[PDB]
C-alpha cells in the first residue's frame, strides 16, 4: 500500500494571503508526505516557475518543501501554486502575494 500525498503541517499553511513590504523575504511552505516520497514544483500565475526571470532567483528546498524569495519587488506580485505529486495522487495549494510600496 503506497499513500497519495498529504499536507503534514496544514496549520502552517493558513496564512494564504501575503502582503509583503518591498525588500522583505517571503517564504511559502507546502510540507507534504506520501509514498513514494512526493515531488514538489511551483507555478506562478499558472506557469512553471524557476525564478530564471526574477532578480536574485529563488531558493528551492525539497528538504523544507518551501519557496523562498528575497528582496520582493512589484513584479513578484501574483499567485504561487505548489504542486505536490507522486504515482498515487496529486495535491495543490495557492498562496496570494502582494508587494507593498
Amino acid at each position: 500500500p503506497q499513500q497519495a500525498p498529504y499536507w503534514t503541517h496544514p496549520q502552517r499553511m493558513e496564512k494564504k494571503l501575503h502582503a509583503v513590504p518591498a525588500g522583505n523575504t517571503v517564504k511559502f511552505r507546502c510540507p507534504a508526505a506520501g509514498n513514494p516520497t512526493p515531488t514538489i514544483r511551483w507555478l506562478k500565475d499558472g506557469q512553471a516557475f524557476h525564478g530564471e526571470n526574477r532578480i536574485g532567483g529563488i531558493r528551492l528546498r525539497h528538504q523544507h518543501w518551501s519557496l523562498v524569495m528575497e528582496s520582493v519587488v512589484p513584479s513578484d506580485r501574483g499567485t504561487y501554486t505548489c504542486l505536490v505529486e507522486n504515482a498515487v495522487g496529486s495535491i495543490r495549494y495557492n498562496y496570494l502575494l502582494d508587494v507593498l510600496e
Partner: antibody
Amino acid sequence: EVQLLESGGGLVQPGGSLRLSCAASGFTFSDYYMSWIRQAPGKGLEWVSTISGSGGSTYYADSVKGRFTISRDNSKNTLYLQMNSLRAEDTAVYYCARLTAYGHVDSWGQGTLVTVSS
Amino acid sequence: QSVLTQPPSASGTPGQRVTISCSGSSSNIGTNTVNWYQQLPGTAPKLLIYRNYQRPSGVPDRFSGSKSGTSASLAISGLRSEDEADYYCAAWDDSLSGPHVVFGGGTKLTVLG
C-alpha cells in the same frame, strides 16, 4: 473604526454598465485584499471578485469573468467594480469586504442594490 | 448553484444542540480553512468562525466550528430564539482555474416551540 461605504447601485437595462464604489477609512487601505460579494434577494452569498492591496492581482468568479473589472484607487481609498454586459441574473445587493491574511472577511459594507431590468 | 453543500434548513427547540453541516472537496475544505457567517434579514453577514474553529471576540462558546476531511460542521448548543438566522460556510478553493472563494448555499435555522 473601520468604515466601508458603498455607492453607485441602481437600476440598469440588460446590456448596460454600472460602476460601484466603496470608500474605506479607519485602516491602511492599500495593505489589504478587498472583495466584492453579492446576494440576490432571498438567495445565498456569492463571491464576485478580489483584488490585492496594490491592485496588482485580480481574481474573478466564472460568471463575471470578461464582463466585470475590479480596480482600486489607493490615493482615494476607494475600491471599484466596473460592471458591463449586465444580465438579469446580475440583480443583487453588492457588498464591499475586507480580507485578512487568512483569506476571510473581517469587515463588510452595508451593500448597494443593483437591479438589472428592462 | 453553490460549490459547498449545506442543508437548506435546520430546526431546534430552545436549549437544544443543532449542527449545520457543510460538504465540500479536497481543493476547498480539505486543504483550505473554513469560515462561518451568520446573516440576519436585511443586514450584512457577521463572522462566527474563522480558521476552522476559532471564534471572533463576542461570539459565545455555544457556537463551535469543526472540520474533518472535506466536511465541516457548525454546532450550536444552548439554542436561543435569537439564533434564528441564515448560516453560511465559506472557503477558498484551489481549482484548475486558479483560487476562488466558494460559499455554501446557506442554512435557515428555525428555533421552535
